[PDB]
């Protein structure tokens, strides 16, 4: 019913970015989760998918650069950047969205990726 | 266009076991001399003559 | 198996009948009891 | 993949008048998996419609939206000062994911 994004921020190229993306009574663990970004002066492009099942699909350009992580008592999901890069500014919209309707988008934390 | 229409699938499995097979092919028949030494192979057994 | 209707008064007759085959199984199971269904209600 | 020219980039409106907004797909798209959603930057996006058929919530359920093709659209029967965002169209497939860059509605 409420949901915060909270650990982002402003860390070095090349390291490990850590982010949880946190909801309050609504069980999202076995819920479609999407991840999507936004570029300073560019528009929303989604970059990650987790489902309820074993199975991960990723964006055609970053692929194995992103680890994605679900709480299993609390719906919480536990997000890893890996080997940044400074034109990977953008600040990180996290979604339950489903295939009928993909409702109850969040605000997103601002964040910003350089040295 | 394509993308968008009913594509009819068919997946076929098989597995080995102690029981025997079955759809082993329609196999082949000659029936070519009847007087002449030959090879007959007549459902599995080996041999020549007359 | 075999069918003889040779049987007269009574008893398991003198003679000889040997047995054809019918038919073969390709059922691999472990057998190890046996039961008859004499199905008169 | 999926090609989505959404029209106009430039908007002259004023409240409380008839707007037809427009987004072009690809190549013969349906509409039943399409998702029609509203933005406002720097804050929460909201939700339209799911399938352009039956309206989302939030809403006062005025806006015609729907299409076929390559022709999706959405009337809104009366403007309000309130929806001064921008609208974002896109459509599913279950395997493969495209976005669509929204259309700035401003006076």
């Given at each position: 019913v409420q949901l915060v994004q909270s650990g982002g921020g402003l860390v070095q190229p090349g390291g490990s970015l850590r982010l949880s993306c946190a909801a309050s009574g609504i069980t999202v663990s076995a819920n479609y989760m999407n991840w999507v970004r936004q570029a300073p002066g560019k528009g929303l492009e989604w970059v990650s998918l987790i489902y309820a099942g074993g199975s991960t699909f990723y964006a055609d350009?970053?692929?194995?650069?992103f680890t994605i992580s679900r709480h299993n008592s609390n719906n919480t999901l536990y997000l890893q950047m890996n080997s940044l890069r400074p034109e990977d500014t953008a600040m990180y919209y996290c979604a339950r969205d489903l295939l009928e309707a993909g409702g109850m988008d969040v605000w997103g934390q601002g964040t910003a990726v350089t040295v | 266009g394509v993308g968008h229409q009913p594509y009819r699938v068919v997946v076929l499995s098989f597995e080995l076991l102690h029981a025997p097979a079955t759809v082993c092919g329609p196999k082949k028949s000659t029936n070519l001399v009847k007087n002449k030494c030959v090879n007959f192979n007549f459902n599995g057994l080996t041999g020549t003559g007359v | 198996s075999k069918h003889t209707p040779?049987?007269?008064?009574?008893?398991?007759?003198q003679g000889f009948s040997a047995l054809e085959p019918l038919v073969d199984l390709p059922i691999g199971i472990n057998i190890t009891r046996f039961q008859t269904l004499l199905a008169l209600h | 993949e999926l090609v989505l020219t959404q029209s106009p980039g430039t908007l002259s409106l004023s409240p409380g008048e008839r707007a037809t907004l427009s987004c072009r797909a690809s190549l013969?798209?349906?509409?039943?998996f399409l998702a029609w959603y509203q933005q406002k930057p720097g804050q929460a996006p909201r939700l339209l419609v799911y399938g352009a058929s039956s309206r989302a919530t939030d809403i006062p359920d005025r806006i015609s939206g729907s299409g076929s093709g390559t022709d999706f659209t959405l009337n809104i029967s009366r403007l309000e000062p309130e929806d001064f965002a921008v609208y974002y169209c896109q459509y599913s497939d279950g395997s493969s994911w495209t976005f669509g860059q929204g259309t700035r509605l401003e006076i």
């Open positions: 350009s970053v692929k194995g650069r | - | 040779i049987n007269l008064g009574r008893d398991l007759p | 013969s798209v349906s509409s039943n």
